[PDB]
Amino acid sequence: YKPPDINKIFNAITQLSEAKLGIERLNQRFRKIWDRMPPDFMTEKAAIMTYTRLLTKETYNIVRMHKPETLKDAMEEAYQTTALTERFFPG
Amino acid sequence: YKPPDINKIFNAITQLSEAKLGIERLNQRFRKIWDRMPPDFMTEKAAIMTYTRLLTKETYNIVRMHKPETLKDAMEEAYQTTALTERFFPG
């Protein structure tokens, strides 16, 4: 195992924004940084919180209906509102 | 009881800085905002984290020796480095 260095991780999440083009840039880097060694970082509800306040205001309105439970649902649901009427299908 | 409204609380902590004159301004408002309805906000270590990265760099160095455990120790220890060689004694 390794030492965690938590403060860079709170530093690295702070860079992410809505200037990132579309949801796919947001969901990718957040998979990169946040999954990199959380030993026990916070509870489930608080892990929603730092994710959700980052997001765009309109996407919070549609993800209000319905509200998700985990990050995976939140990452999926905020993707699906733009994945529907837009795609390039990768392989 | 009341609805919590968590997002204002993360908004209100963001205003605090090192432009606040001395530690006493920092420790007072943080007692006001953070104690106002945390139902279960986060774990103990994470509650250290949002407190500590706010603080001044030199105060992190002295509070490194020794590192505190709870917020109360952290609020006390970062006060004591300036409460020693400076006071107006209140009543």
DSSP A32-82: HHHTS--SS-S-HHHHHHHHHTTS-HHHHHHHTTTPPSSHHHHHHHHHHHH
Query: A4: how many CB neighbours lie within 10 A of its CB?
Result: 13
Token pair recorded at residue A21 = 């083009």
Query: B78: how many CB neighbours lie within 10 A of its CB?
Result: 22
CA gap A57, B35 in Å, rounded:
27
Solved how? cryo-EM
**R_g of chain A, CA atoms, integer Å:** 14
Resolution (A): 4.9
Residues of A in contact with B46 (CB under 8 A): 41-42, 46
Rounded to the nearest 5 percent, the helix, strand and coil shares of chain B are 55, 0, 45
Residue B67 CB partners (closer than 8 Å, separation 6+): none
Q: Do B58 and B10 touch, CB atoms closer than 8 A?
A: no
- Residue A89's φ and ψ, nearest 5 degrees, are -85, 120
For residue B23, the number of C-alpha atoms closer than 13 Å in the C-beta half-sphere is 21
A43 touches chain B (CB under 8 A): yes
Q: What is the largest CA-CA distance in chain A?
A: 43
CA angle B15, B3, B72 (to 5 degrees): 50
What distance in Å separates residue A88's CA from the closest CA in chain B? 35
Token pair recorded at residue B66 = 């020794």
Q: Do A51 and A13 touch, CB atoms closer than 8 A?
A: no
B34 touches chain A (CB under 8 A): no
**R_g of chain B, CA atoms, integer Å:** 14
CA gap A67, B7 in Å, rounded:
16
Q: Do A70 and A44 touch, CB atoms closer than 8 A?
A: yes
Task: Provide the sign of the torsion angle of the four alpha carbons B77, B23, B28, A46, taken in this order.
Answer: negative
CA gap B47, B68 in Å, rounded:
12
Cα–Cα distances (Å) from A70 to A13, A17, A23, A49, A74, in that order, read: 18, 21, 17, 11, 6
CA gap A90, B27 in Å, rounded:
52
